[PDB]
Design an enzyme around this catalytic site. Structure first.
Site, PDB file in Angstrom:
ATOM      1  N   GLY A 132       0.702  -1.165   0.188  1.00 49.57           N
ATOM      2  CA  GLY A 132       0.086  -0.039   0.122  1.00 49.57           C
ATOM      3  C   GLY A 132       0.630   0.932   0.024  1.00 49.57           C
ATOM      4  N   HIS A 189       6.726  -6.350  -5.501  1.00 51.13           N
ATOM      5  CA  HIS A 189       6.269  -5.460  -6.462  1.00 51.13           C
ATOM      6  C   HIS A 189       6.353  -4.023  -6.494  1.00 51.13           C
ATOM      7  CE1 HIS A 189       2.003  -2.982  -6.849  1.00 51.13           C
ATOM      8  NE2 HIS A 189       2.058  -3.503  -7.960  1.00 51.13           N
ATOM      9  N   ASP A 222       1.671  -5.468 -11.866  1.00 54.35           N
ATOM     10  CA  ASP A 222       0.398  -5.534 -11.219  1.00 54.35           C
ATOM     11  C   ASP A 222      -0.175  -6.805 -10.872  1.00 54.35           C
ATOM     12  OD1 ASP A 222       0.777  -2.592 -10.278  1.00 54.35           O
ATOM     13  OD2 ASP A 222      -0.879  -2.092 -11.827  1.00 54.35           O
TER      14      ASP A 222
HETATM   15  C1  TDA Z   1     -11.458  -1.959  -6.682  1.00 46.69           C
HETATM   16  C2  TDA Z   1     -10.349  -1.268  -6.112  1.00 46.69           C
HETATM   17  C3  TDA Z   1     -10.309   0.345  -6.421  1.00 46.69           C
HETATM   18  C4  TDA Z   1      -8.872   0.440  -6.387  1.00 46.69           C
HETATM   19  C5  TDA Z   1      -8.545   0.392  -4.863  1.00 46.69           C
HETATM   20  C6  TDA Z   1      -6.821   0.316  -5.047  1.00 46.69           C
HETATM   21  C7  TDA Z   1      -6.049   0.045  -3.805  1.00 46.69           C
HETATM   22  C8  TDA Z   1      -4.693  -0.650  -4.172  1.00 46.69           C
HETATM   23  C9  TDA Z   1      -4.295  -1.335  -2.924  1.00 46.69           C
HETATM   24  C10 TDA Z   1      -2.609  -1.518  -2.949  1.00 46.69           C
HETATM   25  C11 TDA Z   1      -1.966  -2.549  -1.894  1.00 46.69           C
HETATM   26  C12 TDA Z   1      -1.286  -3.705  -2.913  1.00 46.69           C
HETATM   27  C13 TDA Z   1       0.324  -3.139  -2.833  1.00 46.69           C
HETATM   28  O1  TDA Z   1       0.694  -2.470  -2.336  1.00 46.69           O
HETATM   29  O2  TDA Z   1       0.515  -3.945  -3.826  1.00 46.69           O
END
Ligand code: TDA
Ligand code: TDA
Lengths: 121, 121
Positions: B29, B47, B89
């Site tokens: 995130g 990632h 991704d």
């Molecule tokens: C349907 C979801 C709408 C977009 C929400 C995007 C949230 C992405 C979360 C990132 C976490 C994964 C990581 O860092 O790879």
């Protein structure tokens, strides 16, 4: 119930279920059955006939558990009726996804009252 | 961009991405990287290192196309940078689903500023 059914359709197809299938053809979504228009519609015909064997539970409102495990729908234990209910719903969601190649936008909001009557299940 | 990334994670895992992964461990995130806490967190570490190779496009805001075809993520053509972006991704979404067995709710809202520093990618 409708909530589980809709979720399964979204997981398998990637499509918004209410919009793509809530009034499709003569058999998908609201209302009963009629003569199918195409293979997506025949999936929904089989599904409604699947509901006819459900003994005392409510296909529209009873909730049941299932999980999305390695991208596959797996019906939880639940009771006898809810289990068969979940199995009906899993099979229509897979069938809808299988027949996405022939989905026709012209039947998306079909006028169901003008459908020809369906054969007995 | 974040919209495609979140949708891929929902399609693979079945979980709300913002809530489950928007602040998970030291690498998932928001914010950068840190020493991983577990295998979910290591997926997000890989990632973010995947993102470091992309200097010609914006991982957070550039949109790209892909489709969910027989329950698999397929990156559309797009340009060179967006293609690689889609590929980073797609792999994190698959990794997060593969490691759902060890997902720990105690790292869901992790305090990232106390993470140990990450190794170079
Ligand atoms: C349907 C979801 C709408 C977009 C929400 C995007 C949230 C992405 C979360 C990132 C976490 C994964 C990581 O860092 O790879
Ligand atoms: C996430 C979706 C929330 C519940 C939406 C339920 C819509 C069910 C659509 C029924 C059409 C399929 C057919 O009749 O089998």
């Amino acid at each position: 119930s409708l909530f589980e059914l809709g979720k399964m359709i979204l997981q398998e197809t990637g499509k918004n279920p209410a919009k793509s299938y809530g009034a499709y053809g003569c058999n998908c979504g609201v209302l009963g059955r009629g003569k199918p228009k195409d293979a997506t519609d025949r999936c929904c015909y089989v599904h409604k006939c699947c509901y006819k064997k459900l003994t005392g539970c409510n296909p529209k409102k009873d909730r049941y558990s299932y999980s999305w495990k390695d991208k596959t729908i797996v019906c939880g234990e639940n009771n006898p009726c809810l289990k068969e209910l979940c199995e009906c719903d899993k099979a229509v969601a897979i069938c809808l996804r299988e027949n996405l190649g022939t989905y026709n936008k012209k039947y998306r909001y079909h006028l169901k009252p003008f459908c020809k009557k369906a054969d007995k299940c």
